[PDB]
Amino acid sequence: GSSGSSGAEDRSLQAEPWFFGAIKRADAEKQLLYSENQTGAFLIRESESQKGDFSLSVLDEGVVKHYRIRRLDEGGFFLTRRKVFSTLNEFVNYYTTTSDGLCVKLEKPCLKIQVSGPSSG
């Protein structure tokens, strides 16, 4: 249950749909388990326990696969040593094509349910 958490290196990410600032598996799940969303719906959030770290929550037939997004010291973000990206952008822009290793291929970014206030972007 989240209200409004935001704060990442690239403020621009705030516009990204799959991006949900810093939320908990619970908040992210409810979003994935949603109806409108189907197998493929993904969303990255900022680890709660630790700062900076991210988590890629993807939906696969009602199931939420939590993928720990690790970061390097020379690169940026990477879900699998096999491949590495620079920003959350190129992170999804790639997989979106194929699910190399991933249980499922990223189809579309999760939705953004409004809790308090109108919509904007």
Burial tier of 3 (Cβ tally within 10 Å: 0-12, 13-18, 19+): exposed
Q: With H, G, I as helix, E, B as strand and everything else as coil, classify residue 17.
A: coil
Cβ atoms of residues 116 and 105 within 8 Å: no
**How far apart (Å, rounded) are the C-alpha atoms in residues 54 and 88?**
9
**How far apart (Å, rounded) are the C-alpha atoms in residues 121 and 108?**
17
CATH of domain 1-121: 3.30.505.10
Residues forming beta bridges with residue 83, ordered by sequence position: 80
Parse the chain into domains and list their residue ranges: 1-121
Strands 64-71 and 54-59: antiparallel
Residue 87 corresponds to which tokens in the numbers above?
């920003």
- Phi, psi angle pair for 48, to nearest 5°: -85, -45
Closest CA to 24 of 87, 66, 77: 66
**DSSP class of 23:** -
Cβ atoms of residues 68 and 49 within 8 Å: no
Count of Cβ atoms closer than 10 Å to residue 90 Cβ: 13
Count of Cβ atoms closer than 10 Å to residue 12 Cβ: 11
Burial tier of 43 (Cβ tally within 10 Å: 0-12, 13-18, 19+): buried
Cβ atoms of residues 17 and 110 within 8 Å: yes
Cβ atoms of residues 32 and 41 within 8 Å: yes
Residue 61 corresponds to which tokens in the numbers above?
């037939």
**DSSP class of 66:** E
Cβ atoms of residues 95 and 105 within 8 Å: yes
Closest CA to 54 of 39, 38, 43, 62: 43
